[PDB]
Every structure is written in structure tokens, then in C-alpha cells.
Amino acid sequence: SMNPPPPETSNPNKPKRQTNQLQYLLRVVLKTLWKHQFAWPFQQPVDAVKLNLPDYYKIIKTPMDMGTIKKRLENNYYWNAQECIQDFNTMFTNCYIYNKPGDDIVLMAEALEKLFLQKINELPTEE
């Protein structure tokens, strides 16, 4: 069971903005999670062939990862902060949907999500 194409990261016809909230999502939120010791399983799409998870992309129909989020932010792909926040939440939820409680990967996601939520709590007001 093969891998799907990754999520879209480029679309010239999509309206997009560079806002102070989206800048915070890159400079604070993404950067903080990316450097974390538990980030690496989330820094690129799940390679379900290499990990031998032939059911992964049958169960996870809206895949997301921080490599995709990083590219979207670096490309100014988003219209607003909530679109990007949704991507992070999809990533975390997908982890909890696919895996067992207490699994290492879940503990890793939980550590990243705690930091995510702390940073989002201080999202600046839109300028």
C-alpha cells in the first residue's frame, strides 16, 4: 500500500496574506515545535511504505505534518491564522486517531501540542 501525494503547498490562484498573526505562527509557533527533541516524526509526511503501515492512509484521510506547514508558511500560502492553526490541530488529532494511548508517538505529539497551545494562547491581536 503506497503513499499519496503530499498536501498542496503551492497554489498561485489561492488568495493569501502575510499578517502579523501568520508571522507569529512561523517565527514563534512553528520554530518552537520544529526545534523540539520530539519534532522529527512530524517534520515530513508519514512514509507509510518505509514504516510498513499499509492502513495509515486508509485511516488518515486528511494528512498533515510540520514539513507541509513549514512550506505553507514560508510560501505565504494561508489567508489567515486559523487556517494554519487548523493544520496543526489536524496533525495532532491524526496522531491520536491512528495510534494507541501511551504509545511513544502519542507522548511525542502530546509534548508538542502542550507547547503549541501555550504559544497560541499568546497569539497577538490582528494588526
Ligand X SMILES: Cc1cnc(Nc2ccc(OCCN3CCCC3)cc2)nc1Nc1ccc(Cl)c(NS(=O)(=O)C(C)(C)C)c1
Residue 121's nearest CA partner among 32, 60, 2 is 32
Give the shortest CB-74-to-ligand X separation in angstroms.
Answer: 20
Distance CA(98)–CA(58), nearest Å, equals 10
Site for ligand X in 37-96 (CB under 6 A): 41-42, 46, 51-53, 95
Give the shortest CB-3-to-ligand X separation in angstroms.
Answer: 13
**Of the residues 28, 105, 111, 120, which one makes contact with ligand X according to CB under 6 A:** 105
AA identity, residue 7: P
Distance CA(56)–CA(35), nearest Å, equals 26
Q: Does 99 bind ligand X (CB under 6 A)?
A: yes
Give the shortest CB-26-to-ligand X separation in angstroms.
Answer: 21
